[PDB]
Design a protein around this ligand. Structure first.
Ligand SMILES: COc1cc2cc(c1OC)OC[C@@H](CO)OC/C=C/[C@@H](C)[C@@H](C)OC(=O)[C@@H]1CCCCN1C(=O)[C@H]2C1CCCCC1
Length: 116
């Protein structure tokens, strides 16, 4: 897995499973639109809801890792992310869904990204 953290502490690791298109990667503030299958090393899936997940990148509206990783994706890319708790829900955790010092995995597909 590739370390994409700025401290280089291996807190978020990434493998590209399906390569995306174009050459623009999404800027801070972009409305970004994804599918995801995700879990702790309890599985949660957008395909469960029947509906894409959407947020504004870099506004800390998701855990610190997602803003980092989804920033390194490109349209159509599917990626695998592995996340130490300091870039996820910490030593506080986020009970009941997440315990203390929980490591997390997602499969993410970046569907599209537009402009904010
Ligand atoms: C801590 O509680 C949850 C965690 C997670 C999902 C979740 C949680 O309960 C609300 O509900 C499902 C989604 C779908 O609409 O709700 C919106 C998410 C809001 C954001 C702010 C937080 C909660 O999520 C995230 O930052 C990340 C990344 C985006 C996708 C969801 N993700 C999670 O951490 C998941 C968590 C749930 C169990 C398996 C591991 C991932």
């Amino acid at each position: 897995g590739e370390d994409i953290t700025s401290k280089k502490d291996r807190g978020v690791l990434k493998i590209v499973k399906r390569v995306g298109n174009g050459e623009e990667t999404p800027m801070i503030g972009d409305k970004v639109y994804v599918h995801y299958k995700g879990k702790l090393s309890k599985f949660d899936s957008s395909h469960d809801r029947n509906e894409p997940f959407v947020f504004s990148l870099g506004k800390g509206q998701v855990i610190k890792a997602w803003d980092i990783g989804v920033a390194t994706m490109k349209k159509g890319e599917i990626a695998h992310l592995l996340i130490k708790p300091e870039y996820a829900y910490g030593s506080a955790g986020s009970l009941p869904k997440i315990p203390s010092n929980a490591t997390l995995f997602f499969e993410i597909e970046l569907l599209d990204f537009k402009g904010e």
